[PDB]
């Protein structure tokens, strides 16, 4: 008898499909996946149960043709840390600068999987930053600087084919992600109404729905 299954690390540590990257034949040869633990359109609520969280994460990359055929191509997966420059184009130095770690695997090779540590200057991630970033003044005009805590930035992933001439095989790159060493904090009440924006919990006031189903009356079943 045990309650380990009801622990956070048993409640989150499952590799989910987070990223679906299309690498068609005929656009420029790359794609940039800004890391968001979302995508897996279930993780938000499962995560937004809490406010402050902390975890390292393991990523796994599944690459194939849209057919599913396995083809002898050699990919380059690149982790681009926060602050570091993003790849402008296919041949920018962002691919060779090597500060941004790189993963070179074939597809005949099994999926390369890699772990990423907790990368916030803050002690933990935040899903809620009631306020304006340090140091929010006025002269605003811009209407996005609310509830956004960039301390939750995990970096970005980029792929090549590789150059110079574009590949021959149509590719899709499945990104699978799993959390580790999870520690959550002050507990939130779980979401009840449908989402509308990312990084913002707005709702449709015209269309509010009851949390769960309803009956006709109290005395009936």
């Amino acid at each position: 008898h045990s309650t380990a299954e009801t622990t956070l690390d048993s409640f989150f540590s499952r590799a989910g499909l987070v990223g679906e990257i299309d690498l068609p034949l005929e656009p420029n040869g790359y794609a940039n996946w800004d890391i968001d633990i979302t995508g897996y359109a279930q993780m938000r609520r499962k995560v937004e149960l809490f406010t402050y969280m902390r975890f390292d994460a393991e990523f796994t990359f599944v690459a194939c043709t849209p057919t599913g055929e396995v083809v002898p191509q050699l990919l380059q997966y690149m982790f681009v840390p926060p602050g570091a420059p993003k790849p402008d184009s296919r041949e920018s130095l962002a691919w060779q600068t090597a500060t941004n770690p790189s993963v070179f695997v074939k597809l005949s090779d099994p999926p390369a999987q890699v772990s990423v540590p907790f990368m916030s200057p803050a002690s933990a991630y935040q899903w809620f930053y009631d306020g304006y970033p340090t140091f929010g003044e006025h002269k605003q005009e811009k209407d996005l600087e609310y509830g956004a805590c960039p301390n939750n930035m995990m970096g970005t992933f980029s792929v090549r084919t590789v150059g110079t001439s574009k590949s021959k095989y149509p590719l899709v790159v499945r990104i699978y992600m799993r959390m580790k060493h999870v520690r959550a904090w002050i507990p939130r009440p779980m979401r009840n109404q449908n989402y509308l924006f990312k990084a913002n919990p707005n709702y449709a006031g015209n269309s509010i729905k009851p949390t769960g189903a309803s009956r006709t009356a109290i005395t009936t079943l």
């Binding site: 009631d130 306020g131 609310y146 002050i186 507990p187 939130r188 009440p189 779980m190 979401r191 009840n192 109404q193 449908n194 989402y195 919990p201 707005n202 709702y203 006031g205 509010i208 949390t211």
Partner: peptide
């Protein structure tokens, strides 16, 4: 977002103007 001392009469209670049900507020 910063109503101040006077406070602010919220608009939609059942979801706390945040899609957040009161039914589970007692976790706090």
């Amino acid at each position: 977002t910063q109503p101040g001392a006077d406070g602010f009469e919220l608009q939609h209670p059942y979801v706390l103007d945040a899609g957040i049900p009161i039914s589970q507020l007692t976790v706090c």
